[PDB]
Paper text:
The bacteriophage ϕ29, a representative of bacteriophages with a short non-contractile tail, has an ~19 kb dsDNA genome encoding ~20 proteins. Both 5ʹ ends of the genome are covalently connected to the terminal protein gene product 3 (gp3). ϕ29 infects the Gram-positive Bacillus subtilis cells by injecting the genome–gp3 complex into the host-cell cytoplasm using a short non-contractile tail, leaving the genome emptied virion on the cell surface. Here, we report the cryo-electron microscopy (cryo-EM) structural studies of the ϕ29 prohead, the mature and the genome-emptied virions at near-atomic resolutions up to 3.2 Å. Our results show structural details of the complex capsid, the DNA packaging motor and the entire tail machinery, and provide a molecular basis for understanding the assembly, maturation and infection mechanisms of the bacteriophage ϕ29.
We calculated the cryo-electron microscopy (cryoEM) reconstructions of the ϕ29 prohead, the mature head and the genome emptied head to a resolution of 3.6, 3.2, and 3.2 Å, respectively. The complete mature and the genome-emptied virion models each consist of 235 copies of the major capsid protein gp8, 165 copies of the minor capsid protein gp8.5, 12 copies each of the connector protein gp10 and the tail protein gp11, 36 copies of the tail appendage protein gp12* and 6 copies of the tail knob protein gp9. Structural comparisons of the heads showed overall small differences between the heads (an average r.m.s.d of 0.7 Å). Structural comparisons of the mature and the genome-emptied heads showed that the equatorial part of the genome-emptied head expanded slightly after the ejection of the genome. However, the icosahedral end caps shrink upon the release of the inner pressure, showing the elasticity of the capsid. The ϕ29 capsid undergoes only miniscule conformational changes upon genome loading and release and does not generate sufficiently large holes for the exit of the scaffolding protein.
Residue numbers in the entry:
A (entry chain 1h): 170 to 281
B (entry chain 2t): 170 to 225
C (entry chain 1u): 226 to 281
The structure:
């Protein structure tokens, strides 16, 4: 009787409660007009769909913290411990300054 | 015959395989209860929907 | 959809890249003796220690 009453085969499969993946694609298209949402409903959105779906919900991509560069904000590693200076001569004061410089160089806080 | 068999106009448009954007909104509502997901299916979620979809 | 989780910036460790706090102000040195030069070096060290830029 459903064959006598309905022409569309995708509708008929829905009414029989047995749909193929192709029937489901067509039925999705009857229910939703946004192309990126149709991409989501397929379970296999294209690259363009993915970008647009994130825009649609205001989502970001997985963020990876980059190392600091001389031009670009980034993360650093924390420098090793450095002892306060008790230097009473120039040689030792210079030794202590250099220890700080190396620590900051080791942590990528300043350039080599 | 579909006019004699079904009262709901959005259902009838689905059965004719020709739906407007308004028919699609109503059919989405028959299929999904979560308001934020309905926002996503519209392609135009509200600010609140977007926050809730990310949380989801 | 290629989305990430909410990102929280971790503090720098000796093994892992992270954020730091900016160090307090430090005056340029006008030292003419060793004692003062050492005082100024130590002021820089403490500032960097206070901001978690270098380890205690």
């Amino acid at each position: 009787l459903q064959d006598l009453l309905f022409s569309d085969g995708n509708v008929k499969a829905f009414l029989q409660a047995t749909t193929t993946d192709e029937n489901k694609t067509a039925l999705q298209q009857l229910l939703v007009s946004n192309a990126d949402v149709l991409g989501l409903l397929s379970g296999n959105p294209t690259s363009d769909n993915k970008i647009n779906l994130r825009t649609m919900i205001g989502a970001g991509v997985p963020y990876s913290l980059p190392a600091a560069t001389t031009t670009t904000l980034g993360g650093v590693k924390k420098g090793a411990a450095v002892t306060a200076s008790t230097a009473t001569d120039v040689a030792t004061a210079v030794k202590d300054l250099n220890s700080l410089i190396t620590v900051l160089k080791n942590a990528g806080i300043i350039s080599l």
